[PDB]
């Protein structure tokens, strides 16, 4: 219930369970990771999709179990000059295995010239930075894309939302529910002395 009060979104298409039925199914492990990309790069963040930033920084497999939460963020990461802190890596060797981060600083070689630190006509720096100005349009603005991934069959369920507690009714034959212990009866105060672990 504290998910949809975080500004209007930009992309919330999902490839699995409904976002409203997440309370009805209790999970055990959920993953959380976030990054920022240009608004022209939000489209290819999907299971089985190609593009510029599709196979060189972050890839998604066929099994997803979740979806992204992308919204507009132009008054924290946008300056009248530049915002060069965020960058994307596109001069990579080969295909990237999905759900695997990678950090490197060696200069990529696109030819047969052995580059061991130099940047020639074929060797380029593999880390290219963005540029974030108000002069740029809506399709050239940073969006804080965050994706949630769910894991199954590792442990019994431990993570899921509220249980909708209600009031108490006394001296009336009603049905109740106490931590999964169902039954019908009349609630009455006791005189026994329970041990503080039962």
């Amino acid at each position, epitope marked *: 219930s504290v998910l949809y009060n975080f500004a209007p979104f930009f992309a919330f298409k999902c490839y699995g369970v409904s976002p409203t039925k997440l309370n009805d199914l209790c999970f055990t492990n959920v993953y959380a990771d976030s990054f920022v990309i240009r608004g022209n790069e939000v489209s290819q963040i999907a299971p089985g999709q190609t593009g510029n930033i599709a196979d060189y920084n972050y890839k998604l497999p066929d099994d997803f179990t979740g979806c992204v939460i992308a919204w507009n963020s132009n008054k924290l990461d946008s*300056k*009248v*000059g*530049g915002n*060069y*802190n965020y960058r994307y890596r596109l001069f990579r060797k080969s295909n990237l295995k999905p759900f695997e981060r990678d950090i490197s600083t060696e200069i990529y070689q696109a030819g047969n010239k052995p580059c*061991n630190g130099v940047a020639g006509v074929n060797c380029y720096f593999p880390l290219q930075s963005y540029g974030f100005r108000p002069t740029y349009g809506v399709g050239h603005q940073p969006y804080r894309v965050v994706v949630l991934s769910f894991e199954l069959l590792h442990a019994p369920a431990t993570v899921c939302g509220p249980k909708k507690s209600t009031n108490l009714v006394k001296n009336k034959c009603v049905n109740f529910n106490f931590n999964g212990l169902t039954g019908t009866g009349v609630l009455t105060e006791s005189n026994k002395k329970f041990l503080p672990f039962q």
Partner: antibody
Framework: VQLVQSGAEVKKPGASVKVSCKAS????????IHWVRQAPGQGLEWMGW????????NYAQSFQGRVTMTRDTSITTVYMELSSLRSDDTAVYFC????????????????????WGQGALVTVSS | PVLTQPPSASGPPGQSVSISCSGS????????VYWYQQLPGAAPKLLIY???QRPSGVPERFFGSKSGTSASLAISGLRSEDEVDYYC???????????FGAGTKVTVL
């Protein structure tokens, strides 16, 4: 842009000095101001950047605690409290303007020093 | 490591002159080289940034280039009334600080 300030007063060894160059004509929350000294007859040495929003600054390999750093968003002017002035500190102090924003240690390679103007005179002398 | 520059540049007017700034393997090539020049008794001013763009305020008169370990700042002739010292700047990841050159002052013959 402008970088006019007042001349720094001469300090004996074992003292404290404060220098600050005025910032106006823009908003002081998007460009990180730098500082550098011009030693006579040789090059320059650098100690770190000042982001004018939060505490994320760093220090160089040769300057650990000899420089202490302080921001001020009410006046939009950075402040400095220099300590342990020796004979190697005798140089004019210039605040170097920078373009863009850089918080980490790998984002300033595209950054270039924008504007220099009217530094102060600092001479450490017994 | 330290960055070295010639103490002075011997340049006759009317002919092309250039300066070299040799550094280290982690200082030049992987990072861009910036050239700075200062007036005598005044503030410095950047000359070349990112090795192929030039700032607004200078005519099409100067050129800068980088080739491996050393970077060259080619100058198309020399004006006798305008002589300034030149600087070389780069970045080193191991030192984690900006490094500046010694300073090359052009001198007429």
């Amino acid at each position: 842009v402008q970088l006019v300030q007042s001349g720094a007063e001469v300090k004996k060894p074992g003292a404290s000095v404060k220098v600050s160059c005025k910032a106006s004509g823009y908003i002081f929350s998007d460009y990180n101001i730098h500082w550098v000294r011009q030693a006579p007859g040789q090059g320059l040495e650098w100690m770190g950047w000042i982001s004018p929003d939060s505490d994320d600054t760093n220090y160089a390999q040769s300057f650990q605690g000899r420089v202490t750093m302080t921001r001020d968003t009410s006046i939009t002017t950075v402040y400095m409290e220099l300590s342990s002035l020796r004979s190697d500190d005798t140089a004019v102090y210039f605040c170097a303007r920078s373009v863009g924003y850089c918080s980490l240690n790998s984002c300033q390679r595209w950054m270039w020093f924008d504007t220099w103007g009217q530094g102060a005179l600092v001479t450490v002398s017994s | 490591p330290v960055l070295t520059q010639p103490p002075s540049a011997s340049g006759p007017p009317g002919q092309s002159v250039s300066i070299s700034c040799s550094g280290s393997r982690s200082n030049i090539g992987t990072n861009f080289v910036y050239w700075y020049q200062q007036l005598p008794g005044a503030a410095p001013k950047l000359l070349i940034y990112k090795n192929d763009q030039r700032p607004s305020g200078v005519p099409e008169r100067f050129f800068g280039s980088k080739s491996g370990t050393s970077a060259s700042l080619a100058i198309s002739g020399l004006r006798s009334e305008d002589e300034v010292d030149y600087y070389c700047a780069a970045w080193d990841d191991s030192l984690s600080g900006h490094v500046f050159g010694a300073g090359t002052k052009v001198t007429v013959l």
